[PDB]
From Swiss-Prot, chain A:
Source organism per UniProt: Saccharomyces cerevisiae (strain ATCC 204508 / S288c)
Record's subunit section: Forms a heteromer with RSC30. Interacts with LDB7 and NPL6. Component of the two forms of the RSC complex composed of at least either RSC1 or RSC2, and ARP7, ARP9, LDB7, NPL6, RSC3, RSC30, RSC4, RSC58, RSC6, RSC8, RSC9, SFH1, STH1, HTL1 and probably RTT102. The complexes interact with histone and histone variant components of centromeric chromatin. Component of a fungal-specific module (HTL1-LDB7-NPL6-RSC3-RSC30) within the RSC complex.
Localization: Nucleus
Biological role: Component of the chromatin structure-remodeling complex (RSC), which is involved in transcription regulation and nucleosome positioning. RSC is responsible for the transfer of a histone octamer from a nucleosome core particle to naked DNA. The reaction requires ATP and involves an activated RSC-nucleosome intermediate. Remodeling reaction also involves DNA translocation, DNA twist and conformational change.
Domain of life from the UniProt record: Eukaryota
Protein name in UniProt: Chromatin structure-remodeling complex protein RSC3
Gene behind this protein: RSC3
Any further remark recorded for this protein: Present with 1750 molecules/cell in log phase SD medium.
UniProtKB/Swiss-Prot annotation, chain B:
UniProt function note: Component of the chromatin structure-remodeling complex (RSC), which is involved in transcription regulation and nucleosome positioning. RSC is responsible for the transfer of a histone octamer from a nucleosome core particle to naked DNA. The reaction requires ATP and involves an activated RSC-nucleosome intermediate. Remodeling reaction also involves DNA translocation, DNA twist and conformational change.
Leftover remarks: Present with 4460 molecules/cell in log phase SD medium.
Organism: Saccharomyces cerevisiae (strain ATCC 204508 / S288c)
Subunit structure: Component of the two forms of the RSC complex composed of at least either RSC1 or RSC2, and ARP7, ARP9, LDB7, NPL6, RSC3, RSC30, RSC4, RSC58, RSC6, RSC8, RSC9, SFH1, STH1, HTL1 and probably RTT102. The complexes interact with histone and histone variant components of centromeric chromatin.
Lineage summary: Eukaryota, Fungi, Dikarya, Ascomycota, Saccharomycotina
Places the protein is found: Nucleus
Protein name (record): Chromatin structure-remodeling complex protein RSC58
TM segment ranges: none
UniProtKB/Swiss-Prot annotation, chain D:
Similarity annotation: Belongs to the RSC9 family.
Further remark: Present with 2610 molecules/cell in log phase SD medium.
Stretch of the intact protein here: 292 to 349 of 581
TM region positions: none
Subunit annotation: Component of the two forms of the RSC complex composed of at least either RSC1 or RSC2, and ARP7, ARP9, LDB7, NPL6, RSC3, RSC30, RSC4, RSC58, RSC6, RSC8, RSC9, SFH1, STH1, HTL1 and probably RTT102. The complexes interact with histone and histone variant components of centromeric chromatin.
Localization per Swiss-Prot or TrEMBL: Nucleus
Function: Component of the chromatin structure-remodeling complex (RSC), which is involved in transcription regulation and nucleosome positioning. RSC is responsible for the transfer of a histone octamer from a nucleosome core particle to naked DNA. The reaction requires ATP and involves an activated RSC-nucleosome intermediate. Remodeling reaction also involves DNA translocation, DNA twist and conformational change.
Originating organism: Saccharomyces cerevisiae (strain ATCC 204508 / S288c)
Protein name, entry field: Chromatin structure-remodeling complex subunit RSC9
Curated annotation (Swiss-Prot), chain E:
Function of the molecule: Component of the chromatin structure-remodeling complex (RSC), which is involved in transcription regulation and nucleosome positioning. RSC is responsible for the transfer of a histone octamer from a nucleosome core particle to naked DNA. The reaction requires ATP and involves an activated RSC-nucleosome intermediate. Remodeling reaction also involves DNA translocation, DNA twist and conformational change.
Protein's UniProt name: Chromatin structure-remodeling complex protein RSC30
Subcellular location: Nucleus
Subunit structure: Forms a heteromer with RSC3. Interacts with NPL6. Component of the two forms of the RSC complex composed of at least either RSC1 or RSC2, and ARP7, ARP9, LDB7, NPL6, RSC3, RSC30, RSC4, RSC58, RSC6, RSC8, RSC9, SFH1, STH1, HTL1 and probably RTT102. The complexes interact with histone and histone variant components of centromeric chromatin. Component of a fungal-specific module (HTL1-LDB7-NPL6-RSC3-RSC30) within the RSC complex.
Portion of the full sequence shown: 194 to 227 of 883
Length: 53, 51, 60, 58, 34
């Protein structure tokens, strides 16, 4: 292979049980998911984040 | 077992069930700019299903 | 006041069916067509137009 | 666009109009002349800009 | 959450860093919305 590739376990994609098509419930559950995933990844990596609330 | 007796409430299944066919799709917004502001954008239709 | 998929499809289908049933002349919509035209309202509006025109004519 | 400036209850629209006018009169002076050639634009700017200075600052 | 095995000229570390950046910006935007 002229371009060496790697096996990359990709990023977690947000998946809600009931998709309500409006932005209110979506934004609530999405903020929760974002904070949770940021915490998980900060635990995985040797780094820190700013603005996590 | 932990299964309760069939005579203990509640006893209904679809008490808080919502089918996607009623999920309140997005539509126009209908902004209101004062009273004498007629040269103003009245709608805001960005992610609407119908015009 | 709320719009769901069911409401939208029902509204569109109702409009289509009304139009087609009107094509075959299977519907009598005199009440709607005369509440929208409202010939009494037509006469009232015409007399109002005449009065406003006379007012503008006589101010000179 | 200057009429858009004349509104009051939409900060984002006012900022967009002001950014457009800034980018308009920015390169030189002939565009300033073309802008103030119109009497309506001149009057609206003259009546609006000082009041936009004291916009929502109590 | 869903994880999809993929392939790219990057490494796991750079991908995680890009994910951190994107998620941080998105959370900042969602917070600024309210």
């Amino acid at each position: 292979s002229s371009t060496p590739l790697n096996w990359v376990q990709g990023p977690a994609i947000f998946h809600m049980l009931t998709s309500p098509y409006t932005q209110d419930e979506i934004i609530n559950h999405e903020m929760n998911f974002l904070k949770g995933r940021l915490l998980e990844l900060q635990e995985i990596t040797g780094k820190k984040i700013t603005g996590v609330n | 077992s932990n299964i309760p007796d069939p005579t203990l409430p509640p006893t209904e299944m679809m008490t808080r069930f919502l089918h996607p066919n009623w999920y309140a799709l997005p539509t126009t917004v209908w902004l209101k700019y004062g009273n004498y502001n007629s040269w103003a954008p009245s709608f805001n239709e960005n992610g609407t299903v119908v015009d | 006041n709320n719009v769901t998929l069911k409401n939208l499809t029902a509204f569109q289908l109702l409009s289509q069916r009304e139009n087609i049933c009107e094509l075959l002349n299977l519907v009598e919509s005199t009440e709607r067509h005369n509440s929208i035209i409202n010939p009494e309202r037509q006469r009232m509006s015409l007399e109002e137009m005449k009065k406003m025109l006379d007012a503008l004519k006589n101010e000179r | 666009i200057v009429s858009f400036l004349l509104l009051e209850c939409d900060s984002e629209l006012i900022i967009a109009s002001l950014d457009f006018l800034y980018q308009y009169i920015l390169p030189g002076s002939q565009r300033i002349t073309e802008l103030f050639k119109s009497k309506e634009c001149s009057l609206i700017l003259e009546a609006t800009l000082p009041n936009l200075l004291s916009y929502n600052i109590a | 959450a869903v994880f999809d095995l993929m392939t790219s000229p990057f490494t796991q570390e750079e991908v995680l860093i890009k994910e951190i950046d994107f998620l941080k910006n998105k959370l900042l935007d969602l917070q600024s919305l309210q």
